[PDB]
Design an enzyme around this catalytic site. Structure first.
Site, PDB file in Angstrom:
ATOM      1  N   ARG A  20       0.881  -1.188  -0.048  1.00 52.74           N
ATOM      2  CA  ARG A  20      -0.060   0.013   0.081  1.00 52.74           C
ATOM      3  C   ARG A  20       0.949   1.223  -0.015  1.00 52.74           C
ATOM      4  NH1 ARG A  20      -5.404  -2.133   4.075  1.00 52.74           N
ATOM      5  NH2 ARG A  20      -5.839  -3.530   2.339  1.00 52.74           N
ATOM      6  N   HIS A  66      -8.357 -10.963  -1.544  1.00 50.23           N
ATOM      7  CA  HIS A  66      -9.108 -10.406  -0.298  1.00 50.23           C
ATOM      8  C   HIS A  66      -8.213  -9.335   0.500  1.00 50.23           C
ATOM      9  CE1 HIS A  66     -11.959 -13.751  -0.384  1.00 50.23           C
ATOM     10  NE2 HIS A  66     -11.001 -14.440  -0.902  1.00 50.23           N
ATOM     11  N   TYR A 110     -24.037   2.438  -7.249  1.00 48.28           N
ATOM     12  CA  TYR A 110     -24.865   3.143  -8.055  1.00 48.28           C
ATOM     13  C   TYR A 110     -24.176   3.958  -8.834  1.00 48.28           C
ATOM     14  CZ  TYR A 110     -27.863   1.398  -4.215  1.00 48.28           C
ATOM     15  OH  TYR A 110     -28.430   0.880  -3.273  1.00 48.28           O
TER      16      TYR A 110
END
Lengths: 476, 256, 128
Positions: A20, A66, A110
């Site tokens: 990361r 995961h 959405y």
DNA sequence: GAGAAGAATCATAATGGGGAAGGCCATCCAGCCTCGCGTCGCGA
DNA sequence: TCGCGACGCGAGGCTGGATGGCCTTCCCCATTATGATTCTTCTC
């Protein structure tokens, strides 16, 4: 024992940092975003078709790996939709994403997105064995650790790291300026830093600011360390009743208007200049209209310097400018990004050339068998009539002429439509075409500069397709 | 009721002990009117108990025996029945046949799980003298995925093998760090058919790993024989002929 | 669901994981409006996570801890709560009390099964 | 008278068998990807 | 004209999750025996 604890410390620290923190020099693309783009290419659905509204994509992403949260994967999606933060462009999307405002789009699936235009040519050549692969923990599908490139996005989009040992600021730049830098280092292995000042006049933004300093930029591109000025745009105009009206469009980067305006209200309301009750900061859907009006018997420039002392309209923006390659971090300068991208594209082009030679020489071997079949036919027919088995027919063909097993069986793959003479000439013509193209690829492989010319070709492709100017107006 | 399938859980629900028998005792014994066997008397010496189990059938020859720890050890390894019937009837109609020509009739000693048998020198020794261990392997294959990854797939095992104890021994071999390549140790859907799968990364020489399985692991079986007979109390030892000979003369006395 | 009582069979039915909570979190924390604790941000650094668990209650003092194999070892053995409340309130109203007079308030370290405890020299050492 | 011991009668508890409730397992359904086949394209 | 190869499309099969049915364990209820207490019995 304690040495094994040190081994766990080293290996787990490498795991977290390569996970990361800053990505590779080779891509400048973090592996989360790398797998976003890889799985969206492997969606296969073109950006020509209308871009989708689903978490099914991210479900396949989380099936691929995961994390400690797929909400963070959606955060990666949204932060690559932040055009106001990360530049042009990685999301073809439709849904709510906000601006640099303090916007919270909780509507996750959405929103709409799919592949983007730059991603299309940005990640080609998967079908050419260019990049290596590793298997997932799920032991079912593979993934690439790096990517093929059509520009150093290292320079196109910067870095905002975290302090696992230390964070990293890397500023964005311009498309065609980077192209000219590539051409410059290509034509000359003897460039200077003033040459870099030419082909890169300065780092730019999707929003715009002012960078007044010069030697900070100099130490930035040489040492990799230094801070700059990010300044808001200032326009002094005349109110019809005599007020030094201040118009602001640009800003320092990662600076929301909201809390800055609130602290300006606070600094007004702490026994200071209170007659400036004029803050017309709205209508920013056409651009940025951040307008105040300085009160009477007060100059604008003193309040300007005071808000520069407030460190929000003028900010010392530092740069750490670190990188990851070969498992190590590195303090950055140029000819490192540059030569790294150059030799990476060399790898890509030469391995593509080798794969194309593989396909071409395989098909050349096929058409060898085809033309040698179409030389003499009826004797082969009559000896096949003296046989009853395709193994016998294979042994007969090995007695007849020099072939491969594949060649023999492909000559067995001939219906009566194959028994003409015009198609003999057609196979011979494409055979000579393929031999000419093989000799061309071999001569290209015995040419170092031709690789650079192909790089120039793809640069001119993307240059005819796209360009961009310096929206960030910088005076020094 | 409740038993446990083959994996070390002997379910002993004595309350749930509900059963019947099979239809093979109808072939085994029908001595109602049949003056065959002496009886011994028990409760103040009154009620019958037969000495032996006569039959028309050497089925229990082919079943197998478990009599070990009493004095010296012995067993009976099993065969199947059909070629047993064949070789027996050949001895019946032909009282002067040879051993190996009936070994042409008789396959190896059988097992209910289905075992891979290699070698015949131990077969030569044990059909004669009933002593020796032979080598047994599991039906085990290398299978390629849609990705090209290879898989060790077993179907069954030889006799007296647990899934789970060997599975723990596999997890040992993982943590013992004496075998490499192995990634997945998985087992599912086993009740429609037994499916245990080991799955190994690439660049590992999986067939050499299979060789290492049937060298060191308990998947390889060194199955030994001991058929040390007892004929009317005194201990003896028989060839495969003599068993059927005593069977023949028993059937003689039975039908007479 | 399925757990296993206390005899070495940790039943882990992840499909059957159906539950609620207890009513003691209503005493534990109610920081909705309560400006108490800083937050750290996660998914591209956006969403809150509190640093600590404030309370009005040293219940988790009395619960017990399990933190051993990380560096050096430590735990928290449990007590019960009532005389804990007693000795705490005595320190509240009386800020200058002694240890052993609160050992008069505090019984031995408790256990949920109900244990026979003998000796108090270790109690003297371990309360200190 | 007075005191103690024995037999019989009443009540209580435990064991086994049957009934009901809930949990776990397998099957089916739909969606997505891969293979094969057909239409198109290239050369003399 | 003529033939072979390659890309795209449709159909089939497989996997996971949810739902329903049936099995097993524990509890309760009644019957029988044992222990205890009371009345009657014995001796100076």
């Amino acid at each position: 024992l304690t040495k094994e604890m040190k081994a766990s410390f080293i290996d787990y620290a490498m795991s977290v940092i390569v996970a990361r923190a800053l990505p590779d020099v080779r891509d400048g693309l973090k592996p989360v975003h790398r797998r976003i783009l890889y799985g969206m290419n492997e969606l296969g659905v073109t950006p020509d078709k209308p871009h989708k509204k689903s978490a099914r994509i991210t479900g396949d992403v989380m099936g691929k790996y995961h994390p400690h949260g797929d909400s963070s994967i959606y955060e990666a999606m949204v932060r690559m939709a932040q055009w106001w933060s990360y530049r042009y462009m990685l999301v073809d999307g439709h849904g709510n994403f906000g601006s640099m405002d303090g916007d919270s789009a909780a509507a996750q699936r959405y929103t709409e997105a799919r592949m983007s235009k730059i991603a299309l040519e940005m990640l080609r050549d998967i079908n050419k064995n260019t990049v290596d692969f590793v298997d997932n923990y799920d032991a079912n599908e593979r993934e690439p650790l790096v990517l093929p490139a059509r520009f150093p996005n290292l320079l196109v989009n910067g870095a905002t790291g975290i302090a696992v040992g230390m964070a990293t600021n890397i500023p964005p730049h311009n498309l065609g300026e980077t192209i000219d830098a590539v051409k410059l280092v290509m034509d000359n292995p003897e460039v200077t830093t003033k040459d870099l000042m030419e082909v890169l006049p300065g780092p730019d933004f999707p929003t715009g600011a002012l960078v007044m300093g010069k030697s900070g930029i100099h130490k930035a591109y040489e040492t990799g360390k230094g801070s700059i000025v990010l300044r808001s745009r200032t326009e002094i105009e005349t109110t019809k009743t005599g007020r030094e009206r201040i118009v602001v469009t640009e800003f320092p980067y990662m600076v929301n208007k909201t809390k800055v305006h609130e602290h300006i209200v606070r600094l007004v309301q702490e026994k200071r200049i209170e007659g400036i009750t004029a803050v017309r900061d709205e209508s920013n859907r056409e651009g940025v209209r951040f307008v105040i009006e300085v009160k009477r018997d007060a100059s604008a420039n003193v309040i300007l310097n005071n808000l520069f002392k407030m460190t929000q309209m003028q900010t010392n923006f530092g740069f750490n400018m670190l990188a990851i390659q070969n498992g190590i971090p590195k303090i950055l300068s140029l000819r490192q990004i540059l030569d790294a991208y150059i030799e990476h594209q060399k790898e890509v082009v030469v391995r593509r050339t080798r794969f194309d030679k593989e396909k071409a020489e395989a098909r050349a071997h096929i058409l060898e068998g085809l033309l040698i079949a179409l030389d003499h036919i009826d004797e082969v027919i009559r000896i096949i009539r003296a046989s009853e088995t395709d193994a016998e027919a294979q042994a007969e063909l090995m007695s007849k002429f020099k072939l491969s097993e594949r060649q023999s069986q492909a000559i067995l793959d001939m219906r009566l439509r194959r028994l003409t003479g015009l198609e003999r000439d057609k196979i011979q013509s494409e055979y000579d075409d393929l031999l000419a193209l093989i000799a061309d690829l071999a001569d290209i492989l015995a040419k170092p500069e031709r690789v650079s010319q192909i790089i120039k070709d793809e640069l001119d492709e993307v240059k005819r397709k796209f360009s961009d100017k310096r929206r960030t107006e910088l005076m020094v």
